[PDB]
Amino acid sequence: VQVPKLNTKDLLTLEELTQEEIISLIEFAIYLKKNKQEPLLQGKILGLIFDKHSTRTRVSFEAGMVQLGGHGMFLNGKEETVSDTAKVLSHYIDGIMIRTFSHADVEELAKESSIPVINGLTDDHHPCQALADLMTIYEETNTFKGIKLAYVGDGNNVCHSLLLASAKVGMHMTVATPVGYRPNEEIVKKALAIAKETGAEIEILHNPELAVNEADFIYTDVWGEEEKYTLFQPYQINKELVKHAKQTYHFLHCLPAHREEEVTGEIIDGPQSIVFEQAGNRLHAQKALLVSLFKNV
Amino acid sequence: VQVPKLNTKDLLTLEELTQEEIISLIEFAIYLKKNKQEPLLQGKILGLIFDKHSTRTRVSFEAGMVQLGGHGMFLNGKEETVSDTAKVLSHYIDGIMIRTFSHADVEELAKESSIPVINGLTDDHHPCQALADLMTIYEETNTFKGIKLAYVGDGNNVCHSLLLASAKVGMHMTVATPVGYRPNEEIVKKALAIAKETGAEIEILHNPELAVNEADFIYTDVWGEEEKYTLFQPYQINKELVKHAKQTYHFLHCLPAHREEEVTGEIIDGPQSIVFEQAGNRLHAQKALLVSLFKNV
Amino acid sequence: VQVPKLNTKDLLTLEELTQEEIISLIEFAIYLKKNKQEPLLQGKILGLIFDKHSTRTRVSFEAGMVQLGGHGMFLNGKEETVSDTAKVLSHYIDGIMIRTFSHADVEELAKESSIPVINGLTDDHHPCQALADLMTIYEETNTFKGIKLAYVGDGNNVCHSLLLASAKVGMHMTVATPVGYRPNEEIVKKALAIAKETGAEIEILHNPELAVNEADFIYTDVWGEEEKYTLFQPYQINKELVKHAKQTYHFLHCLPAHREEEVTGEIIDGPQSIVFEQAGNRLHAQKALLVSLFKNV
């Protein structure tokens, strides 16, 4: 097996990876997906820490380790500080995947931990998703040079992670969100700065027709309610809006979905959709990531 | 290893199995029990879903997988619908054992899931138990042709599952329950219909002496309270009642028991009892079931 | 591998071990620590039972099993009595580690269980800790003959376990605790009785300078509050107090710590400290223990 050397212990936002690093990861995920499960992490253990329990993440991670000959250790966020607990894990274990709300907390755990820490999802960031998404796209295009991804919806953590992800690999990305719901300046900013070096064109705006125009890929996600709903109704993915993209676009969604909200069934269940392939690749992307991180011994 | 081909993805009530299928399973469970643990499910994963946490079931399942080289994944019923969650599991995993209260829910999960689903126990059904019970009986008799099982007690889910189980294998079964506590028409009905084809004699009635008469096996289980208790007092298993069965009967109980309620200690701890052997076979029956289901790939 | 034969099924207080038994264990832990992880418990399963969830214990145990080719099964203390549950575990499993509050409960589980039971920690006892501590000391001294350990602080369960532990191996130990907070007569008593046969000198008193005098090792641990705090302030480990020990003493603490309470940072983070080495050895001591217990088949 030709395992990738990452020059980082942790993976938190996506930004601690070089561009080459990200491809190597992707290319490796794909090789693993094709190849019969190697016990590359014999007896290694991944701690799994949760704020609110999240199935999709937990299972995809635990699965991966198990398939790599490892073990996943389910811990809870019913806790001594998140410093003390980092110290401890390190003695007895090989890595940690945390999902919690405050990203600052994760950063802290990483500094203090002496084993790899992986952000399962914080409020601000969701690297692993984006990484599975890039994998999915690359499976289709075999390249990011010259590719447009439109994301329309709420300016959320998966949005952030896509921005950084696209910037890193020189994939162009435009975002359309309603007036209130733009993503964070600080991130947009970082993303733009990465892009200066990869020639990726990143943009944020409001009219979605503009985002989707000539896009190779469209991505949405789920959204007191009375007034909000009426504001996002125009940001729905449908026969009508998707006509402005390329004939040959594919649809992405991180799931789960509420049909006839963010996306019409016609689209999500149509042949343009590849949400399922996407879903699967969570497993594999992560596996690739895990193995690289764990061989920095 | 000579693994049984089941013509079904799921196992919910017992009724999706042919009679041959059930023996093959039993015969296989026994072979496995005798034979040093094969890693027949290397790296496969069984999701374990719980409504209220139940030890006996959870452990017997997890154990089995572990002994088969697999892994059990404990999930909770602190959950998005039970549709969404089925879809997800299927991507990352190989099978699901669910215990929940509403059987309808399980049915749903099975339809929607694209991997095997096993009913750990619903309010109406408890297949796995019955299957371990048949195994136990067969260990003793080596045949169901001509065998009578009496169940006295409450007309509960394990009762149901025994009815169907006995009907399928042509084992005769009579049930005695107090006036209020007969089992469900719909099941009795199905059971009777199966029996028409296997020549099993099934009956439901009230006087327990009648149920136990010439029985090869007696089976009870645990039972506002002030008036109920006085009604079941006569449905106790004891020196007195067991005299009407065959000299050579054996006693079963799925456990746990309240001695000097449903059963006197004399009986349950007497040499006629085989509740322990029963208990053990949970493990093995299940193992057999799991392996067959998982090789329908 | 040269595995130790223990003449006991369970390990609850430390007192069911002979002195030889304890060394053999220690010596084995060390060998295991040095040697690449043997799959000595292939497919064996350790049940893990919790009263309040405790990370350090849970992880160190689960880890160990995993590294020994086993599996740890996390159960909860959301439970039928702790008799019924012992019976059950035994059918499907190989051993149990319990942490609960009432030691009496553990005793009970052990009697009733027909597989090994290990006290993770009760209010009165914490064997596994002490055992990791002895390992740590022995790593340094290679012998207990002639060695003094001072424990100052609250007369707590780890204190108890140290008393018994030291008594068993003929290590001298003095304890200094404030007036209210002496450890239990009944234990001191047992400990003294063991010591009569190993020549260990055990003592309990109040002035800590006396405890630490000419000590080879110093051990503290964490401690309505307004009046208590002022009482223990003098029982702090610091530059000042540690001068009365040997030049060449080492500091122990079971962690976690509150610096500038029981111990000044100067000490705990100083080169005299070996709290980390201590921490690690939890894993290994336990592994050694587990393997010996599990080969009493």
mmCIF file of N, CA, C and O in Angstrom, chain A residues 42-45 62 69-76 78-80 84-85 87-89 91-94 114, chain C residues 52-53 55-56 58-60 62-64 66-67 71-72 74 256-257 275-283:
data_model
loop_
_atom_site.group_PDB
_atom_site.id
_atom_site.type_symbol
_atom_site.label_atom_id
_atom_site.label_comp_id
_atom_site.label_asym_id
_atom_site.label_seq_id
_atom_site.Cartn_x
_atom_site.Cartn_y
_atom_site.Cartn_z
ATOM 1 N N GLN A 42 -4.077 -2.534 12.348
ATOM 2 C CA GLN A 42 -4.238 -3.631 13.278
ATOM 3 C C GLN A 42 -4.131 -3.119 14.688
ATOM 4 O O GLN A 42 -3.174 -2.430 15.021
ATOM 5 N N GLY A 43 -5.145 -3.398 15.496
ATOM 6 C CA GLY A 43 -5.111 -3.074 16.916
ATOM 7 C C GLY A 43 -5.017 -1.605 17.306
ATOM 8 O O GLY A 43 -4.844 -1.275 18.474
ATOM 9 N N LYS A 44 -5.125 -0.705 16.355
ATOM 10 C CA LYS A 44 -5.158 0.688 16.706
ATOM 11 C C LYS A 44 -6.572 1.026 17.146
ATOM 12 O O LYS A 44 -7.529 0.334 16.779
ATOM 13 N N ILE A 45 -6.697 2.089 17.934
ATOM 14 C CA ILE A 45 -7.964 2.465 18.538
ATOM 15 C C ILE A 45 -8.256 3.931 18.328
ATOM 16 O O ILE A 45 -7.399 4.801 18.559
ATOM 17 N N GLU A 62 -16.522 4.492 13.093
ATOM 18 C CA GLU A 62 -16.329 3.215 13.728
ATOM 19 C C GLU A 62 -16.133 2.128 12.665
ATOM 20 O O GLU A 62 -15.182 1.339 12.716
ATOM 21 N N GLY A 69 -9.049 -3.045 10.730
ATOM 22 C CA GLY A 69 -8.501 -3.919 11.754
ATOM 23 C C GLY A 69 -8.348 -3.229 13.087
ATOM 24 O O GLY A 69 -7.642 -3.712 13.972
ATOM 25 N N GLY A 70 -9.015 -2.098 13.242
ATOM 26 C CA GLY A 70 -8.872 -1.302 14.444
ATOM 27 C C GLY A 70 -10.053 -1.489 15.357
ATOM 28 O O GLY A 70 -10.626 -2.568 15.427
ATOM 29 N N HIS A 71 -10.379 -0.434 16.080
ATOM 30 C CA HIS A 71 -11.513 -0.435 16.965
ATOM 31 C C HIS A 71 -11.849 0.979 17.213
ATOM 32 O O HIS A 71 -10.972 1.838 17.247
ATOM 33 N N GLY A 72 -13.146 1.238 17.340
ATOM 34 C CA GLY A 72 -13.648 2.567 17.654
ATOM 35 C C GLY A 72 -14.150 2.501 19.064
ATOM 36 O O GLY A 72 -14.724 1.504 19.471
ATOM 37 N N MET A 73 -13.910 3.546 19.826
ATOM 38 C CA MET A 73 -14.284 3.544 21.222
ATOM 39 C C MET A 73 -15.265 4.673 21.434
ATOM 40 O O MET A 73 -14.917 5.862 21.365
ATOM 41 N N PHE A 74 -16.507 4.310 21.677
ATOM 42 C CA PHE A 74 -17.495 5.328 21.839
ATOM 43 C C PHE A 74 -17.400 5.936 23.212
ATOM 44 O O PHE A 74 -17.590 5.263 24.216
ATOM 45 N N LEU A 75 -17.122 7.219 23.250
ATOM 46 C CA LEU A 75 -17.168 7.942 24.482
ATOM 47 C C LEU A 75 -18.311 8.935 24.437
ATOM 48 O O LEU A 75 -18.809 9.310 23.395
ATOM 49 N N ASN A 76 -18.685 9.424 25.590
ATOM 50 C CA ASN A 76 -19.680 10.450 25.658
ATOM 51 C C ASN A 76 -19.197 11.889 26.083
ATOM 52 O O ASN A 76 -18.112 12.075 26.674
ATOM 53 N N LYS A 78 -20.900 13.561 28.300
ATOM 54 C CA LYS A 78 -21.056 13.598 29.758
ATOM 55 C C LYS A 78 -19.643 13.499 30.409
ATOM 56 O O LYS A 78 -19.297 12.513 31.080
ATOM 57 N N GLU A 79 -18.847 14.552 30.187
ATOM 58 C CA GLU A 79 -17.399 14.557 30.432
ATOM 59 C C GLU A 79 -16.709 13.211 30.096
ATOM 60 O O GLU A 79 -16.471 12.871 28.912
ATOM 61 N N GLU A 80 -13.761 16.967 35.296
ATOM 62 C CA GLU A 80 -12.418 17.289 34.805
ATOM 63 C C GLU A 80 -12.424 17.836 33.348
ATOM 64 O O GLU A 80 -13.130 17.301 32.483
ATOM 65 N N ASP A 84 -7.492 17.645 30.753
ATOM 66 C CA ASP A 84 -7.240 16.401 31.486
ATOM 67 C C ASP A 84 -7.565 15.185 30.623
ATOM 68 O O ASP A 84 -6.774 14.244 30.556
ATOM 69 N N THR A 85 -8.708 15.226 29.939
ATOM 70 C CA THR A 85 -9.169 14.066 29.181
ATOM 71 C C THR A 85 -8.301 13.831 27.930
ATOM 72 O O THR A 85 -8.040 12.701 27.547
ATOM 73 N N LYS A 87 -5.053 14.444 27.793
ATOM 74 C CA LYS A 87 -3.819 13.863 28.314
ATOM 75 C C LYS A 87 -3.952 12.365 28.433
ATOM 76 O O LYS A 87 -2.996 11.628 28.164
ATOM 77 N N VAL A 88 -5.135 11.940 28.878
ATOM 78 C CA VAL A 88 -5.370 10.562 29.289
ATOM 79 C C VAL A 88 -5.484 9.716 28.077
ATOM 80 O O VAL A 88 -4.773 8.727 27.910
ATOM 81 N N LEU A 89 -6.380 10.111 27.208
ATOM 82 C CA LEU A 89 -6.544 9.361 26.008
ATOM 83 C C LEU A 89 -5.184 8.984 25.405
ATOM 84 O O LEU A 89 -4.954 7.831 25.067
ATOM 85 N N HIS A 91 -2.181 8.343 26.466
ATOM 86 C CA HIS A 91 -1.537 7.180 27.062
ATOM 87 C C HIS A 91 -2.053 5.872 26.536
ATOM 88 O O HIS A 91 -1.306 4.967 26.228
ATOM 89 N N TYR A 92 -3.353 5.733 26.472
ATOM 90 C CA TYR A 92 -3.929 4.447 26.230
ATOM 91 C C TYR A 92 -4.360 4.210 24.781
ATOM 92 O O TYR A 92 -4.777 3.122 24.433
ATOM 93 N N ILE A 93 -4.281 5.231 23.934
ATOM 94 C CA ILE A 93 -4.947 5.224 22.622
ATOM 95 C C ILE A 93 -4.108 5.874 21.517
ATOM 96 O O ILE A 93 -3.050 6.526 21.769
ATOM 97 N N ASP A 94 -4.641 5.741 20.301
ATOM 98 C CA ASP A 94 -3.929 6.099 19.100
ATOM 99 C C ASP A 94 -4.455 7.310 18.377
ATOM 100 O O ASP A 94 -3.700 7.996 17.730
ATOM 101 N N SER A 114 -1.568 14.536 22.423
ATOM 102 C CA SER A 114 -0.298 14.189 21.802
ATOM 103 C C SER A 114 -0.517 13.077 20.808
ATOM 104 O O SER A 114 0.411 12.389 20.402
ATOM 105 N N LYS C 52 -21.042 5.480 37.951
ATOM 106 C CA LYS C 52 -20.858 6.703 37.189
ATOM 107 C C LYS C 52 -19.752 6.359 36.195
ATOM 108 O O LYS C 52 -18.750 5.696 36.548
ATOM 109 N N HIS C 53 -19.956 6.767 34.950
ATOM 110 C CA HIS C 53 -18.932 6.598 33.932
ATOM 111 C C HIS C 53 -17.618 7.199 34.344
ATOM 112 O O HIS C 53 -17.571 8.386 34.633
ATOM 113 N N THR C 55 -13.818 7.642 32.677
ATOM 114 C CA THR C 55 -12.943 7.507 31.545
ATOM 115 C C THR C 55 -11.673 6.713 31.822
ATOM 116 O O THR C 55 -11.457 5.652 31.227
ATOM 117 N N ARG C 56 -10.834 7.212 32.718
ATOM 118 C CA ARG C 56 -9.482 6.674 32.823
ATOM 119 C C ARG C 56 -9.527 5.163 32.915
ATOM 120 O O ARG C 56 -8.770 4.458 32.248
ATOM 121 N N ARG C 58 -12.236 2.968 32.285
ATOM 122 C CA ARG C 58 -12.830 2.397 31.113
ATOM 123 C C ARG C 58 -11.888 2.285 29.922
ATOM 124 O O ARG C 58 -11.836 1.271 29.240
ATOM 125 N N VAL C 59 -11.146 3.330 29.653
ATOM 126 C CA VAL C 59 -10.349 3.330 28.463
ATOM 127 C C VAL C 59 -9.163 2.383 28.641
ATOM 128 O O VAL C 59 -8.805 1.618 27.738
ATOM 129 N N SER C 60 -8.549 2.437 29.814
ATOM 130 C CA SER C 60 -7.351 1.651 30.060
ATOM 131 C C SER C 60 -7.705 0.154 29.985
ATOM 132 O O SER C 60 -6.902 -0.698 29.552
ATOM 133 N N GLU C 62 -10.571 -1.182 28.303
ATOM 134 C CA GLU C 62 -10.958 -1.514 26.958
ATOM 135 C C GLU C 62 -9.712 -1.635 26.071
ATOM 136 O O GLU C 62 -9.526 -2.624 25.353
ATOM 137 N N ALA C 63 -8.842 -0.643 26.162
ATOM 138 C CA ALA C 63 -7.614 -0.646 25.397
ATOM 139 C C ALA C 63 -6.880 -1.945 25.544
ATOM 140 O O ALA C 63 -6.507 -2.600 24.583
ATOM 141 N N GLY C 64 -6.658 -2.305 26.787
ATOM 142 C CA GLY C 64 -5.896 -3.497 27.072
ATOM 143 C C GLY C 64 -6.461 -4.696 26.368
ATOM 144 O O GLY C 64 -5.735 -5.412 25.696
ATOM 145 N N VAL C 66 -8.363 -4.838 23.849
ATOM 146 C CA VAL C 66 -8.249 -4.714 22.409
ATOM 147 C C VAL C 66 -6.857 -5.072 22.002
ATOM 148 O O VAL C 66 -6.666 -5.778 21.021
ATOM 149 N N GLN C 67 -5.879 -4.614 22.764
ATOM 150 C CA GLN C 67 -4.508 -4.887 22.404
ATOM 151 C C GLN C 67 -4.164 -6.342 22.617
ATOM 152 O O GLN C 67 -3.227 -6.843 22.039
ATOM 153 N N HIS C 71 -11.992 -7.880 23.401
ATOM 154 C CA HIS C 71 -12.984 -6.862 23.178
ATOM 155 C C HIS C 71 -13.502 -6.487 24.507
ATOM 156 O O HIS C 71 -13.582 -7.318 25.408
ATOM 157 N N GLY C 72 -13.813 -5.204 24.651
ATOM 158 C CA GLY C 72 -14.400 -4.677 25.875
ATOM 159 C C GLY C 72 -15.825 -4.353 25.548
ATOM 160 O O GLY C 72 -16.119 -3.883 24.461
ATOM 161 N N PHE C 74 -18.948 -2.240 26.744
ATOM 162 C CA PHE C 74 -19.387 -1.228 27.652
ATOM 163 C C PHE C 74 -20.824 -1.457 28.037
ATOM 164 O O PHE C 74 -21.715 -1.423 27.200
ATOM 165 N N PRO C 256 -6.584 12.855 38.366
ATOM 166 C CA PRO C 256 -5.977 14.121 37.956
ATOM 167 C C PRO C 256 -5.580 14.957 39.153
ATOM 168 O O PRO C 256 -5.972 14.646 40.276
ATOM 169 N N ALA C 257 -4.834 16.024 38.911
ATOM 170 C CA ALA C 257 -4.392 16.895 39.984
ATOM 171 C C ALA C 257 -4.889 18.328 39.856
ATOM 172 O O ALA C 257 -5.208 18.800 38.774
ATOM 173 N N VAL C 275 4.617 10.785 37.618
ATOM 174 C CA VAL C 275 3.184 10.586 37.539
ATOM 175 C C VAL C 275 2.737 10.060 36.179
ATOM 176 O O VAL C 275 1.686 9.396 36.072
ATOM 177 N N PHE C 276 3.520 10.356 35.156
ATOM 178 C CA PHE C 276 3.184 9.975 33.816
ATOM 179 C C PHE C 276 3.444 8.498 33.593
ATOM 180 O O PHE C 276 2.622 7.749 33.054
ATOM 181 N N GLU C 277 4.641 8.093 33.955
ATOM 182 C CA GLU C 277 4.988 6.698 33.901
ATOM 183 C C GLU C 277 3.920 5.896 34.644
ATOM 184 O O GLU C 277 3.466 4.844 34.194
ATOM 185 N N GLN C 278 3.526 6.426 35.791
ATOM 186 C CA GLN C 278 2.496 5.840 36.611
ATOM 187 C C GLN C 278 1.282 5.648 35.764
ATOM 188 O O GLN C 278 0.824 4.523 35.578
ATOM 189 N N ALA C 279 0.808 6.760 35.205
ATOM 190 C CA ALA C 279 -0.391 6.784 34.375
ATOM 191 C C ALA C 279 -0.411 5.698 33.328
ATOM 192 O O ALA C 279 -1.413 5.022 33.108
ATOM 193 N N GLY C 280 0.710 5.546 32.666
ATOM 194 C CA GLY C 280 0.783 4.578 31.602
ATOM 195 C C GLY C 280 0.594 3.183 32.124
ATOM 196 O O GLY C 280 -0.149 2.381 31.570
ATOM 197 N N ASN C 281 1.259 2.901 33.224
ATOM 198 C CA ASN C 281 1.278 1.556 33.730
ATOM 199 C C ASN C 281 -0.075 1.039 34.130
ATOM 200 O O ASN C 281 -0.229 -0.148 34.337
ATOM 201 N N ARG C 282 -1.071 1.900 34.235
ATOM 202 C CA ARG C 282 -2.405 1.376 34.446
ATOM 203 C C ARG C 282 -2.704 0.318 33.430
ATOM 204 O O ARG C 282 -3.180 -0.766 33.760
ATOM 205 N N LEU C 283 -2.408 0.671 32.185
ATOM 206 C CA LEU C 283 -2.713 -0.157 31.033
ATOM 207 C C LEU C 283 -2.112 -1.524 31.213
ATOM 208 O O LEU C 283 -2.822 -2.540 31.136
#
